[PDB]
Amino acid sequence: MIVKNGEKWMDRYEIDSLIGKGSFGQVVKAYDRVEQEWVAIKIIKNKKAFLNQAQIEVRLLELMNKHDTEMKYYIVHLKRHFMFRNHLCLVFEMLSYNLYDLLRNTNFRGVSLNLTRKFAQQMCTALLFLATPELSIIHCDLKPENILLCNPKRSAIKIVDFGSSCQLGQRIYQYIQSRFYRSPEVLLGMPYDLAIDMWSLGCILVEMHTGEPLFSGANEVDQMNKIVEVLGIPPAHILDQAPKARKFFEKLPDGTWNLKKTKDYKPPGTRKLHNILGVETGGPGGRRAGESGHTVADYLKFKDLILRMLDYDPKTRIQPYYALQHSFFKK
Numbered sequence: 559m560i561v562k563n564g565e566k567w568m569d570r571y572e573i574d575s576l577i578g579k580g581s582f583g584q585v586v587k588a589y590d591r592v593e594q595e596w597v598a599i600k601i602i603k604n605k606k607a608f609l610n611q612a613q614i615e616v617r618l619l620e621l622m623n624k625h626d627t628e629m630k631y632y633i634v635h636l637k638r639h640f641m642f643r644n645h646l647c648l649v650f651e652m653l654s655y656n657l658y659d660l661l662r663n664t665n666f667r668g669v670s671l672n673l674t675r676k677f678a679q680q681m682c683t684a685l686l687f688l689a690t691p692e693l694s695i696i697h698c699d700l701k702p703e704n705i706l707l708c709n710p711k712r713s714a715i716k717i718v719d720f721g722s723s724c725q726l727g728q729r730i731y732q733y734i735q736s737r738f739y740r741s742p743e744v745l746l747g748m749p750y751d752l753a754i755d756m757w758s759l760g761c762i763l764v765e766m767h768t769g770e771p772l773f774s775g776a777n778e779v780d781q782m783n784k785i786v787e788v789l790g791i792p793p794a795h796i797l798d799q800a801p802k803a804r805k806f807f808e809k810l811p812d813g814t815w816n817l818k819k820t821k822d823y824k825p826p827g828t829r830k831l832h833n834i835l836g837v838e839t840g841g842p843g844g845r846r847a848g849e850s851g852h853t854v855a856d857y858l859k860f861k862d863l864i865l866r867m868l869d870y871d872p873k874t875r876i877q878p879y880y881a882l883q884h885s886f887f888k889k
């Protein structure tokens with residue numbers, strides 16, 4: 559759909575400019591003459607596949623809207639939706655630029671542990687809200703691009719893009735999440751729950767501080783090999799139940815598992831998060847040496863929290879309420 563600047567819709571919206579495009583369609587900046595404010599309008603493609611998935615997005619955003627709690631305000635606000643020219647249109651508040659843009663602006667050197675902490679607290683609060691029993695919403699595509707600043711002057715953030723999201727027990731696709739942020743249970747083809755978003759968050763927070771993705775797999779096999787470098791071979795009790803385990807691993811006589819080797823990775827569990835973060839060595843690439851708020855003790859709390867987020871076992875992986883009580887967040 560070609561949307562000209564100055565185009566007026568329904569004696570209400572004046573289209574200004576293109577913010578973004580996705581597989582789903584496009585996001586435009588528009589002036590709402592009724593509320594007298596600028597808004598973001600997500601315009602879905604006029605194809606059944608994109609319409610039907612955006613209808614789930616509208617349902618989940620409206621479900622969240624009717625849950626007024628102090629935990630709901632880290633999610634982008636859907637103001638309303640309408641059909642126009644056979645396109646479903648979702649109207650949101652305006653937000654600012656995304657956390658990938660923030661990282662690009664650091665030259666991929668990362669933000670401070672103090673700003674990482676502020677982002678972590680907001681995102682853990684959002685995940686606590688989505689875990690409300692009557693919502694039980696799995697975002698399914700958390701990544702820096704889907705986390706937006708509320709204001710370019712400030713460090714408040716909101717999650718956007720519920721285009722992949724589903725309630726617990728309403729799973730459609732086995733192949734979900736962006737690869738760098740994909741949980742082991744999804745790589746392994748297992749039934750997933752809200753814990754896959756906590757995995758993603760763990761990955762995101764390390765990247766926000768280092769500047770680089772923690773696990774930048776070129777395909778699923780490379781992804782799982784990059785996870786095993788840092789965390790070791792997944793536990794047997796997980797691999798024993800995993801449809802896709804033999805995509806990556808081999809089982810032996812004594813019920814133990816090992817990596818499937820291909821043509822010539824660091825040995826399992828030897829690429830230590832301790833060294834990626836530079837806990838004892840001045841932070842990532844030693845670039846935080848002597849900076850305030852980047853002490854070994856600060857780093858050890860961060861490292862502990864991340865390793866709880868990167869638990870292989872989705873049943874024992876830290877949950878949002880308990881992540882909010884972690885020492886990383888204590889003054």
Ligand SMILES: COc1ccc(-c2cc(N)[nH]n2)cc1
Binds near residue numbers: 706719
């Ligand atoms: C730049 O302001 C915005 C505001 C909202 C969005 C959005 C909301 C959802 N569900 N996807 N994308 C994007 C950018």
